[PDB]
Write a protein that binds this ligand. Structure first.
Ligand SMILES: [Mg+2]
Lengths: 8, 197
């Protein structure tokens, strides 16, 4: 979804 | 690095890549030239896909994270999105630092600082991360190459150690720590080890 964070 | 304003973030990343994977430098698209308010993510993608240059970008107020911001950037036949993060004092940032341990990992360190034949204590204490607020840490572990789903538990963001118990000797376990930003997202990238007690 975003490059700099991941989905918990 | 951290920024006092969206413009500071933008101007920094006109000269330093916004991406860890490709060299992407921000440039204005061809109204405000880059701040597009509550433009929907899908409309931002359409707009950016019609730009000539890689690095063409905008900043938008997120719909999924109200009151917060997202950076959207053209790269080839794709559009990449970066979540604008806030620290404890309202400063903005995109990426977590730390001058030791493993590069691009959050936390930067993961060591088994104590072990018994069936248990261990993992620690990320030596991570220099007081400037990077963590909501909670998620710890997962399971038999390496196992059938079953991994076991998981969480600890508060003030923690720097975690106990793992009930391990069987001689079995390889994969242990991963994710550093939360909020209640939905973790900072890239998680840190992971394999260990055999
Ligand atoms: Mg990469």
């Amino acid at each position: 979804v975003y490059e700099n964070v991941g989905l918990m | 690095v951290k920024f006092n304003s969206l413009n500071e973030l933008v101007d920094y990343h006109r000269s330093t890549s916004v991406s860890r994977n490709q060299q992407i430098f921000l440039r204005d698209i061809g109204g405000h030239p880059w701040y597009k308010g509550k433009i929907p993510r899908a409309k931002a993608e359409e707009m950016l896909s019609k730009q000539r240059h890689d690095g063409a970008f905008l900043i938008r107020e997120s719909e999924s994270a109200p009151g917060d911001f997202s950076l959207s950037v053209k790269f080839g036949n794709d559009v990449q999105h970066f979540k604008v993060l806030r620290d404890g004092a309202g400063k903005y940032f995109l990426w977590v630092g730390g001058s030791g341990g493993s590069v691009s990992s959050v936390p930067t360190k993961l060591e088994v600082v104590a072990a018994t034949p069936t248990s261990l204590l993992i620690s990320w204490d030596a991570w220099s991360g007081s400037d990077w607020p963590v909501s909670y840490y998620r710890i997962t572990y399971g038999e390496t190459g196992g059938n079953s789903p991994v076991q998981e538990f969480t600890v508060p963001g003030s923690s720097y150690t975690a106990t793992i118990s009930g391990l069987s000797p001689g079995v390889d376990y994969t242990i991963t720590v994710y550093a939360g930003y909020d209640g939905k997202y973790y900072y890239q990238s998680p840190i992971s080890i394999n260990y055999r007690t």
